[PDB]
Amino acid sequence: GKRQRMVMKLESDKTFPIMLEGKINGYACVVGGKLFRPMHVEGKIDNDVLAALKTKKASKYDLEYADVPQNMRADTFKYTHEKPQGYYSWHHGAVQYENGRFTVPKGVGAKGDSGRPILDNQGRVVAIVLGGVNEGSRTALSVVMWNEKGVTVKYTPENCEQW
């Protein structure tokens, strides 16, 4: 429960829910000085400054990137590409990273918890959750991430449902 306190205290400032008729459908994430928002999530950004923007579309990677004003570039997530195997710290507890795939134990994951970042033991974002499929006792995840070259990579398992 100690890692989930860290995730909630880092999401209290830098994560914004995308509300449609009050209902949560997704989360905009401000990482590295650029706003991120998925395509299929419908609604508006909770923050008033971020809602009045012109988000350039990128339909392949299921993202709608934007740019952050200069007074807000220090209040962003830090991120990295470095990802050894083991455990990472999601919003609902922990998430296993094995063979280049983020897996969460089952039950959790429904319509609405998309766009949530995955943190490491230092406090840096390594992935952004878009969707996932339930492989029985454990749910694989479809995320975007980065690599050592500096290239945005999206991983997508089979038959993933958009969250």
Partner: protein, 49 residues
């Protein structure tokens, strides 16, 4: 004599029909080759994980 079809086509006009119709095929095949190389390079960049 007998008027053959394409009898008076005047090599200048053969050149204008070869360039403005065969050259557009050259444009579309180099566009298709460029698109194929771009798709393979994007897949090579996402081989990194």
């Amino acid at each position: 004599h007998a008027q053959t079809f394409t009898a008076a086509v005047s090599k200048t006009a053969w050149t204008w029909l070869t360039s403005l119709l065969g050259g557009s095929a050259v444009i579309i095949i180099i566009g298709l080759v460029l698109a194929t190389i771009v798709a393979m390079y994007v897949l090579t960049n996402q081989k990194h994980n």
